[PDB]
Symmetry: C2
Subunit: 144 residues, 2 copies
């Protein structure tokens, strides 16, 4: 839809969002995440680390939402989906680290020392979060 | 705690945040809200409206969290609480509308036309949401 494309435009137009996961007690857990939006596949990809609260929540209940703010700093879009998570990075060139490399390119371009990047992924036990967008809602720029 | 004050400072330093309510199916519901923060009684105040999803959710389950961004746009603080809601504004002079007028003053001072403001609150079925902060976390700048 034109709408909603106005919401996706808010998502494709930014890189920082509020990730919302579900605590064991059922209430939301919120944090900021950097992301890359794949408009062709309608995916949102995030790099997260195994021992963080957001990761543990998602392994337990894969349902995730991301709110992205528009340029006006008023309006917003929220993407919902069911997260898919890679295993944590365990070797400097396993498929997980390879995917995180591709993610960092999409977000930040060419890395200074890729080999250190590779080692940090293993060390910090990084995970690729892939979130297929199954529903969008929000208040697109242009209305009340 | 030391950590605490740095987070609470983030909340004092802003007036828009992301409000998270809980949907019927257990999923968080997210939206931007404008708020006033009382650093004394440690509570957040928000003007919402009865017809909205966020309000329906909170009347079913009063747990709320609000995330607030630091100036660097990356650091942030989250406050959790159990929401307190007034009845919806029903008459231009009732207690709810008065509370919201006090809130509007705390946020943006004096309003152009209080009489149209009063009316708009009733037409909106506006609600005053009070969130005593029961817990804070996040990543201070
Ligand atoms: C600070 C922390 O955020 P985080 O998602 O763990 O990760 C921190 C960073 O990754 C993040 O700030 C970004 O900058 C990147 C956080 O949210 N802590 C919460 C914990 C919330 C939470 O979900 N706890 C789990 C714990 C689950 C368990 O026991 O392992 C739960 O309640 O189910 C809090 O202090 O209340
Ligand atoms: C859009 C809908 O959210 P809602 O709770 O009904 O709330 C319409 C909202 O846009 C509206 O209530 C507020 O977000 C507008 N709004 C404020 N609305 C307020 O109630 N209070 C505010 O202080 C306020 C400030 C504000 C600042 C920025 C901004 O972009 C919007 C702001 C929604 O979440 N739909 C979902 C979830 C439905 C559900 O939870 N059940 C869906 O369609 O899937
Ligand atoms: Na953590």
């Amino acid at each position: 839809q034109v709408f909603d494309d106005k919401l996706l435009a808010v998502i494709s137009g930014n890189s920082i969002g509020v990730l919302a996961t579900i605590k064991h007690d059922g209430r939301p857990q919120l944090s900021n995440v950097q992301y890359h939006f794949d408009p062709r596949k309608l995916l949102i990809q995030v790099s997260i680390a195994e021992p963080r609260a957001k990761t543990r929540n998602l392994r337990r209940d894969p349902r995730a939402s991301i709110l992205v703010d528009a340029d006006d700093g008023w309006s917003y879009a929220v993407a919902e989906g069911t997260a898919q998570l890679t295993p944590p990075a365990a070797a400097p060139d396993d498929d997980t680290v390879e995917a995180l490399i591709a993610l960092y390119r999409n977000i930040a371009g060419e890395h200074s020392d890729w080999d250190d990047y590779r080692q940090a992924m293993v060390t910090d036990r990084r995970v690729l979060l892939t979130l297929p967008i199954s529903h969008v809602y929000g208040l697109p720029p242009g209305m009340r």
